[PDB]
Design a protein around this ligand. Structure first.
Ligand SMILES: *[C@@H]1O[C@H](CO)[C@@H](O[C@@H]2O[C@H](CO)[C@@H](O)[C@H](O)[C@H]2NC(C)=O)[C@H](O)[C@H]1NC(C)=O
Ligand SMILES: CCCCCCCCCCCCCCCCCC(=O)O
Ligand SMILES: *[C@@H]1O[C@H](CO)[C@@H](O)[C@H](O)[C@H]1NC(C)=O
Lengths: 49, 49
């Protein structure tokens, strides 16, 4: 409960220097997919189909 | 101008091999398909090969 009054103010007499972290993702892993090796790996008939 | 992905590095097979068990006898085709007596259908004969 802030002690509100119509003629009262609160003024700081001191300070604190505060250091905080913020962690942000920037990139992810770059992946490539060979379709023929995934679906039809080392099979000629599957590649033709 | 640039850099382009392609198919992954394939190595082709050099020869073909066949590995079957050391089996010399022929299957009893004369005993199965040329038997003297055949069973009835209610008492059908089961033979292990
Ligand atoms: C403002 O805050 C600072 C930090 O809390 C006070 O500095 C401390 O003062 C006490 C008493 O003199 C010491 O025991 C501590 O070692 C001090 N801390 C540091 C980091 O120096 C300072 O006294 C405060 N000033 C006022 C006017 O209140
Ligand atoms: C004596 C039974 C041997 C069991 C062998 C089981 C393995 C299956 C291979 C096929 C065997 C029977 C083939 C039937 C031949 C048909 C020829 C035709 O079409 O006239
Ligand atoms: C089938 O059986 C009959 C009677 O034993 C025989 O004469 C015939 O040669 C047999 N055939 C084969 C292919 O074994």
């Amino acid at each position: 409960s802030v002690a509100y009054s119509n003629n009262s103010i609160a003024i700081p007499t001191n300070f604190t220097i505060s250091v905080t972290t913020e962690i942000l993702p920037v990139s992810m892993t770059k992946t490539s997919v060979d379709c023929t090796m995934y679906i039809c790996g080392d099979s000629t008939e599957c590649s033709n189909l | 101008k640039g850099i382009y992905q392609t198919s992954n590095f394939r190595v082709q097979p050099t020869e073909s091999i066949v590995r079957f068990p050391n089996i010399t006898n022929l299957c009893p085709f004369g005993e199965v398909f040329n038997a003297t007596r055949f069973a009835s259908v209610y008492a059908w004969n089961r033979k292990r090969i």
